[PDB]
Amino acid sequence: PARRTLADIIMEKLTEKQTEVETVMSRVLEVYRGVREVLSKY
């Protein structure tokens, strides 16, 4: 149980680190590629 609790605490710490990293770091495609190919040699 102590090892499982330590693993859960480590998982919570890893999730907190991931959240901190996320904080620190922070149909139209086809038709517009078609008009891109049209206007490339228009």
């Binding site: 480590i10 901190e20 990293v21």
Partner: peptide, 13 residues
């Protein structure tokens, strides 16, 4: 000691 998984998580040169 943590935050290395997030360091390798970001893949930018």
């Amino acid at each position: 000691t943590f935050s290395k998984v997030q360091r390798f998580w970001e893949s930018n040169s």
